[PDB]
Amino acid sequence: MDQVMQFVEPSRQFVKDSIRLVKRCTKPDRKEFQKIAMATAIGFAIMGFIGFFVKLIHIPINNIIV
Amino acid sequence: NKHQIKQAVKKLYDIDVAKVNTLIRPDGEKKAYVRLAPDYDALDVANKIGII
Amino acid sequence: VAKQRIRMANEKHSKNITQRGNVAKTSRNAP
Amino acid sequence: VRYSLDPENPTKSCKSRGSNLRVHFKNTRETAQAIKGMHIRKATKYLKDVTLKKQCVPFRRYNGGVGRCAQAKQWGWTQGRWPKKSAEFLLHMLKNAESNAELKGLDVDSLVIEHIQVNKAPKMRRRTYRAHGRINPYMSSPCHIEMILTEKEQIVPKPEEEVAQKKKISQKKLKKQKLMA
Amino acid sequence: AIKFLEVIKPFCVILPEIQKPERKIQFKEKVLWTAITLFIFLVCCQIPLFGIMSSDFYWMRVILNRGTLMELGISPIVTSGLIMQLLAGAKIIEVGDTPKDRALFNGAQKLFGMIITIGQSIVYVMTGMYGDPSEMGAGICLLITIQLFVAGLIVLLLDELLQKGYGLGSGISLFIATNICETIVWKAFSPTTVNTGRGMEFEGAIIALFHLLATRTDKVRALREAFYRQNLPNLMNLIATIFVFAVVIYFQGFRVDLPIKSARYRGQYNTYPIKLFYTSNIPIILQSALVSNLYVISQMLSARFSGNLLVSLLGTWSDTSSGGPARAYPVGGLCHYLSPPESFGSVLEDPVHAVVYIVFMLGSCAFFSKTWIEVSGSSAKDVAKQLKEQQMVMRGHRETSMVHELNRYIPTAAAFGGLCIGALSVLADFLGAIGSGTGILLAVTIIYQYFEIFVKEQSEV
Amino acid sequence: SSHKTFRIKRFLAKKQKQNRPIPQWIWMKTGNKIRYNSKRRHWRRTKLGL
Amino acid sequence: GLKVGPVPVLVMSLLFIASVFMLHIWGKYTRS
Amino acid sequence: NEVVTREYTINIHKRIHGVGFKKRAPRALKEIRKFAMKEMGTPDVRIDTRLNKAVWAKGIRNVPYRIRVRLSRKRNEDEDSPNKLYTLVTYVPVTTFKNLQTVNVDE
Amino acid sequence: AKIKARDLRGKKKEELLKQLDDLKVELSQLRVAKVTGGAASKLSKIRVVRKSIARVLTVIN
């Protein structure tokens, strides 16, 4: 059945390919996940609020400018 | 020996073996060519073992 | 494969004498 | 790194040296004595003629067995030879000294080989197999070369056909540069 | 090649460059330059552009960051680089393989953004997105083009500064993330006031909560409105953003580590990681640009052959003008199926329509990834050549079998990375998270990079 | 020869593994004096005798 | 091709922010 | 008129007279190359593989007495070489050598 | 979760053997990771699990 095996077989291989890859990946551990949690969190606070600060200080200037 | 190797491979990985060939390498290590039963896909089993 | 191809390529290669330094790496440009 | 002589006016000089060069010491001593005192362009042209056998290096001290040639009569001598390896080793050293002059901003076309010196380097040990089950030394005789080039008042430009050559690119040089870069 | 590499020649000889650092710069010196560099960019992100009054509208420029010296943003530089590597990767553009030709090549890729800087600006001026050039004239256009030129010009050197060891990582990545992080915190602590028929109230979700919790007698109503604004940020949209953040962090670290070693030295064991998001965010980005213009293109098409069932069946279009501004929505057909839901209930109303979109959105990014690799120059063969160029090799393998071992994962990590890229992006779009699934990945990735450098320096800092 | 004993083939293998250059990190040890493996062997220059 | 030190960038970049500051300030107050 | 082509007869017999058997055909190739510099004044002489085949057609010692050759001075296409021109030497089979002058050939 | 010999003293023989088997399985999985590109963290774990196994066997003996 060309019409069936033509595009079904690549998709069935595709599903079995992802599992073969996924069971090969070095998935981060819970301990590593926790490490990336704090690191990202502290970083996001660092970038989020300092970039936040520049915007608030520019407000009083911007209201005067316009 | 080939009997022990067959019993080891089956028990460790819960697979079936068709035959075991063995050579002792020039560096002194023994290499086992373990052929699995036809219903066992060696590429699949290798993924389980982490070989690939 | 036709055996006269051996002669044809040999003579073609013998024509590189006039084009030294710009010999085309592959004549079969397609692909 | 101490040279045997101090330049007379250091700001007007350029240095160059090499160590453990695998070029015969006796041949290179004679070759250096030929170009000593020459203007850099004249010296460069002369060692390119030694390569092509159009000018001989007189062998004056280390001359045991050396043959006679018609070109040796230029130097008031009967014995001469055409050491190609010594000529080429000394050209590479001249090129390096020439570059060092350029880096210091000297007038390269006014340079003269004021000082040049060939020293024996530690010999390298091979062997050769003699009759009656004997073994004998097979010594290479390398040398240290050091030169000093100085500005003088005679100016000689580079030949026209010489500066017209392409700056040859080195594929193998690129390959190593990729690895580091 | 001949009429492109040499055309750059005259101009790159005059354009400036940043100097090599003599020695390896101190980290606490790196931090100083970075913080300075980031601060300046941030300042550019707020300063209003000079002389823009007609249209983008002025009141929004008071609110906004649209209209700032970053108005054209880092986009020209990113688009400049992608277009180069896109053509270069495909072999369409030939890159001089020497470092000096590479140093010029850098200037060429720099040159594009400077070209793109003027090109993108011209589009916005003539169309009235700042205002008619007749209203502004040459002088006002002169300054606006110059300012839009200098900001990207500054942005370029500042990134090149960090790229060359005067700081940490690269500016562009730092810059795009800082925007992402700021948007998230702003939308939680924004003191903006919204003038409603219910009164005046604050915008920032955290700020709005305590402002409402005291301002409303119905404290359950605060529990409802505060977390379920349908035109304003909600604590949910914060919670939706936070939840995605963790999952991306989990799948950020996915990678298949292949063993490799130097073919020139014993031991020295290392590894080449095939990252699951092998294609970065490019696949979905290209997919989104396709979908958006397919909506625009159909709009103009369907107004000329609407009576033909095929053009209608292709995709219908209407004009929603009830109250708010006339916004163009699809009415049916393929484009209708290629659209995401705008409300949760809408997914329930039509079960088929939702699955049709998702298969398109998972298939498109996955298919984009698979096709992107070959063109982008990241396929196994290209990867193997890079490893061969670096004199690396898989132990026990010949140089050819490397390609066989790389194709085990790279072609699949391509598609599944794209499918994973889309799927998480559906959650970002569906659950109202801020910045789309593209944005969070960008943010998490960048912060991860600086973190792992940061810890290494902390080893002796 | 091809015809080998187990004892001989095993003794040969140990000679095979000893015949390698030193790790380069050994140079960076605190009191280290070794510059190279001075016990290298070549199958032609010097023979094992067994 | 000029090779640039970070200070030049900071000095150039710093004064550019200074310039637009006057232009925004001057544009209004002197036209007020 | 740098690019030019002429047809010559070379008296190989008198060029290799008195040479040893195992060097007779190697030396003819040398005397043909030396002839080329003299006629065209070009260090870069390139001897065609047919002319080499013709010179060796009778072994190493019974080399042909006369050989008709064509010299064509051409522009050296590579600018890396120091030589602007080179000479190409091709074989010209002739049923006879009697009365053959040195001829100008015009393409 | 380190195998300290003080935590094994009272345990029963079948319990300790089970604990031993987990360590023997954990090691063979690491020995695979040694040749298939295991992280430097996993290479350093081998000695930790070789000695853990020896600790269990000592207490059993």
Ligand SMILES: [Mg+2]
């Ligand atoms: Mg004597």
Ligand SMILES: [Mg+2]
């Ligand atoms: Mg004698």
Ligand SMILES: [Mg+2]
């Ligand atoms: Mg003997």
Ligand SMILES: [Mg+2]
């Ligand atoms: Mg022997």
